[PDB]
Amino acid sequence: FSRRRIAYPFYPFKKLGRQHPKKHDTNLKTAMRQFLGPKNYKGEYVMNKYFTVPTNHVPNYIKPDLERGQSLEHPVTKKPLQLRYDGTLGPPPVENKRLQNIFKDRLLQPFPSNPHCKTNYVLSPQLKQSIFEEITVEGLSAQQVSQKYGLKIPRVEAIVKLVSVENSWNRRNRVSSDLKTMDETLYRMFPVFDSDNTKVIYGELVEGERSQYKFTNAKVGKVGYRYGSGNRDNKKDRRIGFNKLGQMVYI
Amino acid sequence: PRKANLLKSLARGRVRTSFNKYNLFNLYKKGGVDLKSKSLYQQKWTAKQETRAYHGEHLTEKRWQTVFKPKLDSVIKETPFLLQTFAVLEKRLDFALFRAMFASSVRQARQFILHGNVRVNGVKIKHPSYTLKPGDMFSVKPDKVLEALGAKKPSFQEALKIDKTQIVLWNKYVKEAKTEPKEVWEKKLENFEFDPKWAKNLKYHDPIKLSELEGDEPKARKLINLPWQKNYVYGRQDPKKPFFTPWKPRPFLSPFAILPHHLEISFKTCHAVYLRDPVARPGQSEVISPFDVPVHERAYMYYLRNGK
Amino acid sequence: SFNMENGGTRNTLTSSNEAALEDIKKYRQLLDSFAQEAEDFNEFKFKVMYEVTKMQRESINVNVFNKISLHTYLSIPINLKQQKEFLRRLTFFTFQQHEFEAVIKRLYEGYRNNLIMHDIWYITCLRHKIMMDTTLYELVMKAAIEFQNEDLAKKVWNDRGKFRTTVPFLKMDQRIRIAKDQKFAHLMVEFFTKQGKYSDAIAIILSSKNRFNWTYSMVRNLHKALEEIEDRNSVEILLDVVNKK
Amino acid sequence: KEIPRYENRTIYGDIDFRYHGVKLHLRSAKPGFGLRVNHVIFEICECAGIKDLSGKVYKSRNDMNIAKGTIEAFTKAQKTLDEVALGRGKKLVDVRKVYYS
RNA sequence: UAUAUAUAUAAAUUGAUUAAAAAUAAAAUC
Ligand SMILES: [Mg+2]
Ligand SMILES: [Mg+2]
């Protein structure tokens, strides 16, 4: 058996009662408004748990199963606030023990359904600068630093490249106040990593010649475009690549 | 590609690769994918529906089938091999941008690439279907990333109305403080949990009528001056950048803020390096996805046989 | 100690400085007398071999004191993770062959034509000591791996190289010698893998690919360590070395 | 009933079984290889804990008989390598298949 | 350097009287 199942919230919510004929509302919209909470004149939803980003280096990921759909807290005191029959937000009768007892792994789990998905730790700027100094200045290999800091070699090389690019951008004053704010904010939203031959002929060039020929040695029977090769231009297996300029070319 | 149509419908409840408020609610209320009481074909169809709604929705079905790779890569807990069903889409440039938190959604990443705001190893790339190889460096224009991650820039009229309300509320607070400073100080300290000059320091603010002030931005900029908001209209400190100018994060950013395992990101420069293709290891899969392993298993079974 | 002393009947382990001086005197007499009789250095060395072999049997039980029992005795602290006791036991109950032969040459030069009494005391102390065979060297290498002591590993590889020159090693067959050398090389590879010096381990593996057959069992730890850091080039090189077959 | 499972994911070897007119040919599979079998066999493997399998059903395709034959084949048409080694008086290394490149 | 702003009135397309929706779909804004 299978049928269309409108994705109503799995948790309890306040369904529509008798409606004035012109409301033209839906239970889904009411559930969305209950999850969102009241909206400000500025357009914000301060009541919601997740409206504002975290700053304690611990992510704030949705936990609909643990909180049973109650996603409204006081913006300042950060204490739970449930809808009441009078229509106001107020303290809950009994506080959910599940929300105090949260496993450390689940805090790094972005999506409630998938446990295997987890966020990655963000390296501190000091560690990146230390890696830059260790590699470029002290001449250490990527293997030794990767073993030293519990890191992987491709990540070490990427860190080297990124720190070099950051140094260049800081040289040109390209990093701006807004960019600094954005970097700082996204830094505090994530957990922080803890350290502990073929012959070649280059041709003669003459004035006025716009190009120079390059001749590569090759072996007969292996060099050339084959005769009768399959044509995939009109097939779903058509082969596409990108030029050195970056344009798209059929291969 | 497909035309974006009802990507955030609450009734259908599909989850998309996006930071939408409606997408957030759809993800929040979903719970899990219900596979009980369904035949094998129905289970496979539901799994395909959900996973393709999230993974590569903008791709056409036949194009995804051609791009689909029946093989999977991996490198004590059980390794989730079949979460790698959609790992092939992760090397695409737009997907890399989205996973690097340089775009609010894969569609916005596609638009950023198509409009010439993205570079890969220093050469401009204008094709979202471009595929990255390990070690490839890509970067985005900083203004585009700030717009994608920053809050929306208000218009002059809306921000003027917000400033009217702000001036009004400041005047109300000033009146309350001046009339009864005792209870105001008591409330302030209680919320945190005397000198009469404090209430003298507070100053009223001239109420503003927008009918005469409309159409002239510098006049309003000079007239509006609040202790936090000095000499600019709400959200328009410098009305020439494409975002809410006093830069604050877009709303509902924390639910989707996920740091990838296969990309290394430098947000100061809006640069990133594609370390590797996502792989599956014991107890973890580097393919970010909101669906559990059985859903990907059923989608893989569907796409092995083309829905046969 | 109770077993060494045959239940206390032999007072070999109990020692005194008076006994030390008197034994040094007696053995100086015996050896500096012996120095002249022998036809050549080889014959004097043979006399010293017989002397030490008979002395050790006279002083300590032959059956109880041997390679196997000493191996277990020294293996105790390694499992118990006590380096000081292991080193004390190793020094006290084991003698290195090359040092002994060097002492024989030195005493030959001294007699035929404070250090002298030290050499005499060495020859006297041989009654408490067993020659360090290849298995005991491998055991000390295992102790180096367990304790993560670079100094011990360096000293052990020096002593192993010197022991290779000594006659007891060359007495054995070529195949046994190759097997023991391969075991030592694998132990060194494991040591460098634990120390994190993967470059040194791959260097050892590559340098001796032809003379030693490298299997995946020996390099499994190295492969795991290299995969954990994702050094695909080194992994490919090592796998090519092992699996070229 | 408990069923033998090789590496907790698949059957130990190829199984050719006969049940009341249903011929089951079930082949083991590599890690990551999904369940590619009759839907009844797919559900039975899902409940049993078998993750990797291939197979084909010949002659009768009755769902009830397929299910009973699948259970009985898992129970009698299967033997652990430990059992084989102990019965033949050999070590597990002697009965493991050697790799050929 | 305040900030869960709160009150009013007015309206509110198709279906329906609540798990019956169309529908964030429109408009509008950037
Ligand atoms: Mg149907
Ligand atoms: Mg009507």
DSSP string, C141-173: HHHHHHHT-HHHHHHHHHHHHHHHHSHHHHHS-
Residue B261 and residue B285 in contact, taking contact as beta carbons nearer than 8 Å: no
- Burial class of residue A188, CB neighbours in 10 A (0-12, 13-18, 19+): middle
In 3-state terms chain D splits into helix, strand, coil percentages (rounded to 5) of: 35, 20, 45
Query: Are β-strands A240-242 and A214-216 bridged in parallel, bridged antiparallel, or unpaired?
Result: unpaired
State how far the Cα of A5 lies from the Cα of B27, in Å rounded to an integer. Answer: 16
Number of Cβ within 10 Å of residue C185's Cβ equals: 18
Q: How far is CA C145 from CA A184, C67, C148, in A?
A: 45, 21, 5
Rg (CA), chain D: 14
Q: How far is CA B119 from CA B137, B270, B271, in A?
A: 8, 11, 9
Which structural technique was applied?
Answer: cryo-EM
Residue A192 and residue A121 in contact, taking contact as beta carbons nearer than 8 Å: yes
Domain, as residue range, for D57: 15-94
HSE-up of B45 (CA within 13 Å, CB side)?
Answer: 10
Any idea what the CATH number is for the domain that residue D52 is in?
Answer: 3.30.230.10
Tokens of B151: 């809050």
Residue B21 and residue A51 in contact, taking contact as beta carbons nearer than 8 Å: no
Number of Cβ within 10 Å of residue A238's Cβ equals: 12
Residue D33 and residue D52 in contact, taking contact as beta carbons nearer than 8 Å: yes
DSSP D88: T
Residue D37 and residue D55 in contact, taking contact as beta carbons nearer than 8 Å: yes
Query: Does residue D39 form part of some domain?
Result: yes
Query: Does residue D9 form part of some domain?
Result: no
**Which region holds residue B4: left if phi is over 0, alpha if psi is between -120 and 50, else beta?**
beta
Tokens of C136: 């005991």
User: What single letter denotes the amino acid at residue B122?
Assistant: G
Q: How far is CA A251 from the centre of its chain?
A: 33
State how far the Cα of C226 lies from the Cα of B74, in Å rounded to an integer. Answer: 16
DSSP B273: E
Backbone angles phi, psi at C202, to 5 degrees: -65, -30
Residue D44 and residue D71 in contact, taking contact as beta carbons nearer than 8 Å: yes
Query: Does residue D5 form part of some domain?
Result: no
Query: Does residue D8 form part of some domain?
Result: no
**Set of chain C residues whose Cβ sits within 8 Å of the Cβ of A152:** 229-230
Residue B119 and residue B125 in contact, taking contact as beta carbons nearer than 8 Å: yes
Tokens of C240: 């090519």
Q: Mapping DSSP to helix (H, G, I), strand (E, B) and coil, where does residue D54 land?
A: strand
State how far the Cα of B244 lies from the Cα of B235, in Å rounded to an integer. Answer: 5
Mind giving me the DSSP string for B119-188? EETTEE---TT-B--TTEEEEE-HHHHHHHHBPPPPPHHHHHHHHHHHHHHHHHHHHHHHH-HHHHHHHH
Residue D39 and residue D70 in contact, taking contact as beta carbons nearer than 8 Å: no
Tokens of D100: 């050929």
User: What single letter denotes the amino acid at residue D67?
Assistant: A
Query: Does residue D44 form part of some domain?
Result: yes
Closest chain A CA to residue B31: A10
Tokens of D75: 């129970």
State how far the Cα of C115 lies from the Cα of C109, in Å rounded to an integer. Answer: 13
- Burial class of residue B62, CB neighbours in 10 A (0-12, 13-18, 19+): exposed
State how far the Cα of B139 lies from the Cα of B102, in Å rounded to an integer. Answer: 9
Residue A13 and residue A33 in contact, taking contact as beta carbons nearer than 8 Å: no
| Total tally of structural domains belonging to chain D | 1
Tokens of B111: 């638009």
Residue B55 and residue B289 in contact, taking contact as beta carbons nearer than 8 Å: yes
Backbone angles phi, psi at B91, to 5 degrees: -85, -10
- CB contact burial C21-39 (16+ within 10 A = b; e otherwise): eebbeebbeebeebbeebe
Give yes or no for D34 touching B (CB within 8 A): yes
User: What single letter denotes the amino acid at residue A25?
Assistant: D
User: Can you point out the beta strands (E) in B48-144?
Assistant: 118-120, 123-124, 136-140
B131 CA to E26 C1' distance (Å): 37
State how far the Cα of A242 lies from the Cα of B10, in Å rounded to an integer. Answer: 40
Cβ distance of B127 and A61 shorter than 8 Å: no
**Set of chain D residues whose Cβ sits within 8 Å of the Cβ of B297:** 34
Tokens of D39: 């839907």
Q: How far is CA A126 from the centre of its chain?
A: 22
**What dihedral angle (degrees, nearest 10) is formed by the CA atoms of A145, A149, A150, A153?**
-30
Q: Mapping DSSP to helix (H, G, I), strand (E, B) and coil, where does residue A111 land?
A: coil
Cβ distance of C199 and A147 shorter than 8 Å: no
Kindly identify the ligand whose nearest atom is closest to the C-alpha of B42: 1
Query: Does residue D73 form part of some domain?
Result: yes
Query: Does residue D10 form part of some domain?
Result: no
User: What single letter denotes the amino acid at residue C29?
Assistant: Q
Query: Strand D53-59's sheet: what is its strand order?
Result: D15-19, D22-27, D53-59, D35-36
Q: How far is CA D42 from CA B40, B47, B295, in A?
A: 9, 16, 15
Number of Cβ within 10 Å of residue A194's Cβ equals: 10
Closest residue, CA to C1' of E14: A24
Q: Mapping DSSP to helix (H, G, I), strand (E, B) and coil, where does residue D19 land?
A: strand
Report how many Cβ contacts below 8 Å link chain A to chain C.
21
The shortest CB-CB distance from B80 to any of A116, A175, A177 is to A116
Q: How far is CA C215 from the centre of its chain?
A: 26
Chains in contact with C, counting 3 or more C-beta pairs less than 8 Å apart as contact: A
Helices (H), A138-214: 142-148, 153-171, 177-188
Helices (H), chain C: 17-37, 41-59, 67-80, 83-93, 97-112, 115-125, 134-147, 150-165, 167-171, 174-195, 198-207, 216-229, 232-243
Strand partners, A215: A201
| Residue bearing tokens 């090592």 | C238
The end-to-end CA distance of chain D, in Å, is 39
State how far the Cα of B147 lies from the Cα of B153, in Å rounded to an integer. Answer: 9
How many helices, marked H, and strands, marked E, lie in chain A? 8, 6
**Breakpoints of chain B, after residues (C–N > 2.5 Å):** 75, 193
Tokens of C89: 């036991």
Helix (H) or strand (E) holding B42: helix B40-54
Residues 6+ apart with CB under 8 A from D45: D35, D37, D51, D53
Residues 6+ apart with CB under 8 A from A92: A70, A80, A81, A82
Query: Does residue D101 form part of some domain?
Result: no
Q: In chain E, which nucleotides are within 7 Å of a protein Cβ? A: 1-6, 12-25, 29-30
Residue C34 and residue C49 in contact, taking contact as beta carbons nearer than 8 Å: no
